[PDB]
Write a protein that binds this ligand. Structure first.
Ligand SMILES: CCCCCCCC/C=C\CCCCCCCC(=O)O[C@@H](COC(=O)CCCCCCCCCCCCCCC)COP(=O)([O-])OCC[N+](C)(C)C
Ligand SMILES: CCCCCCCC/C=C\CCCCCCCC(=O)O[C@@H](COC(=O)CCCCCCCCCCCCCCC)COP(=O)([O-])OCC[N+](C)(C)C
Ligand SMILES: CC(C)CCC[C@@H](C)[C@H]1CC[C@H]2[C@@H]3CC=C4C[C@@H](O)CC[C@]4(C)[C@H]3CC[C@]12C
Ligand SMILES: CC(C)CCC[C@@H](C)[C@H]1CC[C@H]2[C@@H]3CC=C4C[C@@H](O)CC[C@]4(C)[C@H]3CC[C@]12C
Lengths: 196, 196
């Protein structure tokens, strides 16, 4: 493994991307992947097993955990990474297919599809940011929550596992997503300006 | 033990009480004593040991039981019986003392002290009825209670032991107390009418 191969793999074979999406976006993507890898198994490993409520009612822990955590942060970020990386994979596959078909026997089409893929990537980033805002208003996570879902009688106190570490990693991931959004917008603007 | 001795002991040596307070009040007193004896140990024996709340908080059962049962029905009725029987004991002791002092060496004084003792007995009956009404509004007892006393978090469901049997015995004791009140009022009225 060399640098000239890793850089080519990350950038794809596309020849229209500038240094914003070729030197900076790949680095932020690697940063997000590494943070998700080092945080998924350790911090969020026992989010449900150590989630306890102050009640004797059977089945209250599971219903309260599902009520307060419809989909955990780790899985939300994994889905966000997959959806954000899908258009880049599509562009790389399309470039490879065009190279194959020209070998066995255009620039504007590649430029347009790259612009469309960057727009879709920005749209996915914004959609996942909005979903995270809807599900979990506020970056901070609290230690104690009040759960009144059936079958829990009245309202019970349930305790979250590692609120502070999860808050730190949430801040990191949200900052990385914001940087990605800014870089995508800058890339779109630069391409439009240079094309005109 | 013969009837002519039990009747004399129950009525005392007082010669002013009519058949209302000599034949009927003693029977109702015996009825109340027997009901209290057969209900105190069995029905109310495990009122606190089997009082459970739906929570994991230590010490919530005791605080909730004390909140909802400041003083149990059995002890309230025992204190009521003792206080109601105190004036009769005082009258009997006074009659015995007068007999002793006249032997070693009046009717109006005995009549007045008997009337005063009956009035005090009626007052004690009314006071204990009012106290029971204040502490436990309504004869019926519920199975489930909502307890929000410290240290219990939020509101917890606590379960009472034998609500229906305790309701039945409460009805019996309240009916007996009402009959005693009516008989005391009738005795006072009869004495006042006959004296004038
Ligand atoms: C997302 C998770 C990240 C975790 C943190 C990772 C951080 C650290 C991880 C990785 C850092 C890199 C480690 C190896 C570096 C040596 C490379 C090398 O010598 O290349 C040379 C030889 O190499 C080859 O020909 C084969 C290259 C294999 C490298 C390892 C493959 C993946 C290992 C997966 C491990 C799985 C377990 C990992 C954990 C699950 C290059 O070939 P060459 O013939 O010299 O080139 C031509 C010669 N010429 C130039 C003179 C003309
Ligand atoms: C509040 C709780 C209530 C519970 C329900 C109770 C229901 C049932 C209970 C009780 C009913 C009565 C049982 C005994 C009746 C026999 C009486 C008798 O024969 O008397 C005779 C003899 O007797 C005596 O001389 C002594 C009397 C002792 C009686 C028992 C004393 C208390 C027992 C306590 C027990 C403790 C355990 C109880 C449970 C804790 C009378 O004497 P005599 O010499 O014949 O008289 C003169 C002779 N002449 C007439 C010919 C001139
Ligand atoms: C500018 C940034 C966004 C470019 C990022 C490039 C990403 C989307 C590309 C570069 C290399 C790609 C990987 C290359 C090889 C494989 C192995 C295959 O069995 C599953 C997909 C997987 C794991 C690809 C996933 C997508 C991937 C990680
Ligand atoms: C008209 C009605 C209210 C009269 C009722 C009479 C009551 C008050 C009298 C009759 C016999 C009495 C009992 C006779 C003997 C004793 C034994 C003594 O060591 C304690 C008190 C005790 C237990 C007395 C308590 C009061 C008593 C039960």
């Amino acid at each position: 493994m060399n640098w000239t191969g890793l850089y080519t793999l990350l950038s794809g074979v596309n020849r229209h991307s500038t240094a914003i999406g070729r030197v900076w976006l790949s680095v932020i993507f690697i940063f997000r992947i590494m943070v998700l890898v080092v945080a998924a198994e350790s911090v969020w490993g026992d989010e449900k097993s150590s989630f306890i409520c102050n009640t004797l009612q059977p089945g209250c822990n599971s219903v309260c955990y599902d009520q307060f955590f419809p989909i955990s942060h780790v899985r939300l970020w994994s889905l966000q990474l997959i959806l954000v990386s899908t258009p880049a994979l599509l562009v790389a596959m399309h470039v490879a297919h065009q190279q194959h078909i020209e070998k066995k026997m255009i620039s504007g089409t590649l430029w347009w599809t790259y612009v469309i893929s960057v727009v879709f990537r920005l749209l996915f980033e914004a959609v996942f940011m909005y979903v995270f805002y809807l599900l979990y208003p506020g970056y901070a996570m609290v230690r104690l929550v009040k759960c009144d879902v059936y079958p829990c009688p009245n309202t019970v106190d349930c305790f979250v596992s590692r609120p502070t570490e999860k808050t730190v990693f949430t801040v990191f991931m949200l900052a990385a997503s914001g940087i990605c959004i800014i870089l995508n917008v800058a890339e779109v603007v630069y391409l439009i300006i240079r094309a005109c």
